[PDB]
Structure formats: C-alpha cells, structure tokens
C-alpha cells in the first residue's frame, strides 16, 4: 500500500495550510489512525497528532487533524517561522504502519 | 521523557548489531516502542513495534526477517538486532513511543544512530 500525498507546500506567516494524505487502496477512514511527525533540521523528531485527530501532550493546538474526503490532512492554522521542516504521515493497515513520502513544508 | 540511543556502529556485510534506547522519565511498560529506518531519499520506513509489558511483537512483512525487537524491564531499555547485513541497511534508526489506550499517537522520539554497513579493506 503506497501512501501518497504532495511533494512540497510553500505558506505564509500567518496563514493557513492543509497538508493531505492519500492511500491507494482506498479512502482513509477511522481504522487508519492516521499519524503525523515533524522532521526539523538535525534529526529531531516530535509526533504531533495520532488516531487521526487526538494530539499529544506538548503538542502545539494549531496542528489539527481530520478526515477532508478520502484523505487524512494535517491543518496548521497560523504558520510559524518554526514549523519550516518536513512532515511524514503514516497509515495502519491492520497490521502495520506505512509511512509515506513526505511533504517539505518552506514558510517565508 | 528521554530516549537515549547507542552511539554510532561500524560493522561488516555478514554480521549483525545490536543497537539500543534506555527510556526514562515515565513508566516503561505502559507505553510502546517503534522502530523506523531513515535512509536519504526514501523518507521513513516502518520495521515493527514492541509493547514491554509482555514483549509481543508486530513486524513489517519486509523487516520481519530483519530486525528482533525486545525489551529489558529492568533497565526500562529496547533494542533491535539487525542480522545479515547489506548496503540495503544503512540507515540511522530511530525508536519512538506511543501512547495506545483509546488512540494511537506520537510524541517522543530519539536522536538516531546512523549505521555504516562497510566492508573491510
Ligand atoms: O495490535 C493491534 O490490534 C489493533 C491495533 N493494534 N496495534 C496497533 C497499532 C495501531 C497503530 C499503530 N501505529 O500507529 O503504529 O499500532
């Protein structure tokens, strides 16, 4: 199962931004629990959302999740100059994770 | 919350290592431990789960023959054996915990520990 989703975004300061991730073998529901993770420079990883819309503790509450068609997305209402970093999503099958491309998101 | 991985490893095509992630600030046993392979151009890529309160396990049908994840209780520690190395498997490993009761979502992650599977000259 391939996990599509856009190669890159460019937003503003300030303005909002959705993120999307797409699976291949159908719609994405609420067996999916789709994952979110935030790759800054210097290897840091820090999970932002899970289980499609519960976010974790120390977790910004600009980063939302949802279900927007046949896709799980990632909001980010009010982009900082610090959210410029990568972000992996990642579908569970049934049995196992599948983490996708990834989407290199450039705030100016 | 702390995930402290092992240093970086040199081994040769053939062998196997056995990396680590000491946990500690929380409690071990209630939360689980993934393991992803970062290589450049390929983004992430799932390898299994462990929870510690019992060591099941749950593998990628790719790593399943790959990776050996288990756990040590009283160190609060998690490893992954690497067997029957290739150029395939260099990549910087990362473990990161899951809180799983009601839904599953990340948090915290480690530093990494970036694998050079090289042959000796
Ligand atoms: O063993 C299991 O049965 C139903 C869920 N389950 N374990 C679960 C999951 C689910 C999601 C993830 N995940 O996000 O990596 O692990």
């Known amino acids: 199962a391939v996990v599509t989703q856009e190669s890159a975004l460019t937003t503003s300061p300030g303005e909002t931004v959705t993120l999307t991730c797409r699976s291949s073998?159908?719609?994405?529901?609420?067996?999916?629990?789709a994952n979110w993770v935030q790759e800054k420079p210097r290897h840091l990883f820090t999970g932002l959302i899970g289980?499609?819309?519960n976010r974790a503790p120390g977790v910004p509450a600009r980063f939302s999740g949802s279900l927007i068609g046949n896709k799980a997305a990632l909001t980010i209402t009010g982009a900082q100059t610090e959210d410029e970093a990568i972000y992996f999503c990642?579908?569970?099958?049934?049995?196992?994770?599948?983490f996708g491309g990834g989407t290199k998101l450039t705030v100016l | 919350v702390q995930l402290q991985q092992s240093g970086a490893e040199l081994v040769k095509p053939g062998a196997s290592v056995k990396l680590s992630c000491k946990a500690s600030?929380?409690?071990?046993?209630?939360?689980?431990m993934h393991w992803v392979k970062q290589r450049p151009g390929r983004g992430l890529e799932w390898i299994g789960r462990?929870?510690?309160?019992?060591?099941?396990?749950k593998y990628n049908l790719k790593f399943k023959s790959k990776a050996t994840l288990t756990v040590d209780k009283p160190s609060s520690t998690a490893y992954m054996q690497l067997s029957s190395l290739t150029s395939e498997d260099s990549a910087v490993y990362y473990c990161?915990?899951?809180?799983?009761?009601?839904?599953?979502?990340?948090?915290?992650w480690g530093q990494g520990t970036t694998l050079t599977v090289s042959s000796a000259a």
């Open positions: 289980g499609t819309n």
């Open positions: 073998t159908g719609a994405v529901t609420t067996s999916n629990y």
């Open positions: 600030g929380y409690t071990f046993t209630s939360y689980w």
């Open positions: 990161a915990r899951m809180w799983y009761y009601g839904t599953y979502y990340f948090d915290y």
């Open positions: 990642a579908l569970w099958y049934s049995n196992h994770l599948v």
């Open positions: 462990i929870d510690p309160n019992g060591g099941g396990t």
